[PDB]
């Protein structure tokens, strides 16, 4: 459902998430991005 | 293919955000 | 530069990447979305490999 995926993005602040992997990612430029990816959501998920 | 069109404009958004946010 | 990072964005289709995320993201609608992205990183990489 569309508006159901709206408002989870929205509750769980998805877009901020992902615009600070990004600027994560244009920093490093990785050799292996979804690596570098991962790492990043591991770090987090800790912090 | 809603929720595909969603996550195409998203990505766009996110990616322009991040790159006007590194400079 | 926003060039180097655009040239990498483009090169590795990042745009891509990010939606195929979103729509994980919206069709699994995780409790820990944190933990939900490593795992489908690391899924990823795993197919790649393959």
Same mark, same amino acid.
């Not at chain 1, 990612?25 to 050799?31: I, M, N, S």
């Given at each position: ?30 050799? %292996?991005?979804?690596?570098?990816? %991962? ?9 | ?7 195409? %404009? ?14």
């Amino acid at each position: 459902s569309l508006r159901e995926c709206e408002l989870y993005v929205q509750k769980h602040n998805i877009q901020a998430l992902l615009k600070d992997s990004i600027v994560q990612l244009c920093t490093a430029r990785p050799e %292996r991005p979804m690596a570098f990816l %991962r790492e990043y959501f591991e770090k987090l998920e800790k912090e | 293919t809603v929720i595909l069109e969603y996550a195409h %404009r998203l990505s766009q958004d996110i990616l322009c955000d991040a790159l006007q946010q590194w400079a």
